[PDB]
């Protein structure tokens, strides 16, 4: 009389131990592959006062290529994969499967735009821990890559109809989450550290900072953006400033596929039937989430 049944499970891309594990992992990978020449980081005591700590170490820079990594399940546990269409990322999944390792991932540290990630199968999907809460980041997953090619010439090229269509479809999904009679407008970052204010990322081991104003100024040919490579920067693994070694060659190239974005919606009790969105990012954890949102490690029982 016993009946057969598919084992469903509840996922929460926003509370995933795999994300935190990867964050510490990417960090370890870096500290043993791209150390700074000088690292200045805060050093505080309970009282509340702080003195600056300076660390000088060998900072050998070697040409770096993308090493694909994935996460596998240790003896005793299993990794569930949600396979539902346009999965929200939170709640119970129906068509679930099991895998030995996650898909192949090419980690990339960045802000505003997500690079060389996994695309959406169906159409564009936007996900947030809570859309009503404007203080929560919205992770946009594109279903179609937009190539952006850089050059030490100080500017990265990007299609204009490609990226204009991208904003046009993203805006549509935002209306499906906030309202169809609402007006969507994209605005640049409201400010902060340069890394936050610009589309910054690390390519080949260099830190690029590109102006993204032309990318986030829209009302519902090539688009060249001014990029600059810095040697002194604010660290992403922790609060502090660091100075990395100067570029080896000269004219540092970079080819990447924009697969997603990190956006925030301006909070406003302002009843105006219009919602504004700016480029977000900063916590590389959301970056790790956009890739691990459909995974959940569970105990074999």
């Amino acid at each position, epitope marked *: 009389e016993v009946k057969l049944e598919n084992v469903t499970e509840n996922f929460n891309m926003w509370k995933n131990n795999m994300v935190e594990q990867m964050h510490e992992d990417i960090i370890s990978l870096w500290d043993q592959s791209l150390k700074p*020449c000088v690292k200045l980081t805060p050093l505080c005591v309970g009282a509340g006062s702080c003195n600056t700590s300076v660390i000088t170490q060998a900072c050998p820079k070697v040409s770096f290529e993308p090493i694909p990594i994935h996460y596998c399940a240790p003896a005793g546990f299993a990794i569930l994969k949600c396979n539902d269409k346009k999965f929200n990322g939170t709640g119970p999944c129906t068509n679930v499967s099991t895998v030995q390792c996650t898909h192949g991932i090419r980690p990339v540290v960045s802000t505003q735009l997500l690079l060389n990630g996994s695309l959406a199968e169906e159409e564009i999907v936007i996900r947030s821990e809570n859309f009503t809460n404007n203080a929560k980041t919205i992770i946009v997953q594109l279903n179609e890559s937009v190539v952006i090619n850089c050059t030490g010439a100080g500017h990265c090229n990007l299609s204009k109809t490609q990226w204009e269509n991208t904003l046009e479809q993203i805006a549509i999904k935002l209306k499906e989450q906030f309202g169809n009679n609402k007006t969507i407008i994209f605005n640049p970052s409201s400010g902060g550290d340069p890394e936050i204010v610009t589309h910054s990322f690390n390519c080949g081991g260099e830190f690029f900072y590109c102006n993204s104003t032309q990318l986030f100024t829209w009302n519902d040919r090539n688009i060249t953006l001014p990029c*600059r490579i810095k*040697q*002194i920067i604010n660290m992403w693994q922790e609060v502090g400033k660091a100075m990395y070694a100067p570029p080896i060659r000269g004219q540092i190239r970079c080819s990447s596929n924009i697969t997603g974005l990190l956006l925030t919606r301006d909070g406003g009790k302002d009843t105006n039937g219009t919602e504004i969105f700016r480029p977000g990012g900063g916590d590389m954890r959301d970056n790790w989430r956009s890739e691990l949102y459909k995974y959940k490690v569970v105990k074999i029982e």
Partner: antibody
Amino acid sequence: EVQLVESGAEVKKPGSSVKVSCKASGDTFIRYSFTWVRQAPGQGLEWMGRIITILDVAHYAPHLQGRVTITADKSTSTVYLELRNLRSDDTAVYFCAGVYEGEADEGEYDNNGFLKHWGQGTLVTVSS
Amino acid sequence: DIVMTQSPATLSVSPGERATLSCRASESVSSDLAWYQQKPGQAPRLLIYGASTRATGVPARFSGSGSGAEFTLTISSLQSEDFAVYYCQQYNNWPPRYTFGQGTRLEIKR
């Protein structure tokens, strides 16, 4: 393309300390790193330390076990070199020097260790 | 740490003739090698840096070459202003611990 000028000569008693100044003018202070080189009478050049002014971080030569400190004041474009518990054999001409690092205020830094601009040098005699 | 040796200690060449100074690193330094000229009572002057690039305002008769742990400064026509002491300095190691050579004085041969 700067101009470096140091303070006058000094006579010091053993066990005291001296602080030589170097006024840099002619260009953006925070875009140059400054080094201090000493030379006892009849000897060669001795590297003492260099300071990355934009980061306000200084590095020194090992055998100067905390008796030396290199500082900078962006407010006056002036580098300083303090030396403590002086010994008669600390008598030498101390030179101040610097080189261009690039657009530091924009994040770029060559971190060049050579010396292009020099001060006139300052004689520091240590004796009883 | 990195010991820089210059040779000869003293070199006697005739005015208008060619001179060549040697500098050796106790280990590799790549091309972070600079050359300085110092006349008595005066401060040092930077001639070469990058091992082979000549600073601005420095006569074309002055030229550097070398790499690794072996470098050489060359003057192709000694002038009176050219008879002084020359030092080589490495600055490729990090944490920084830059070091100068002990010098090579150039004297007029008569």
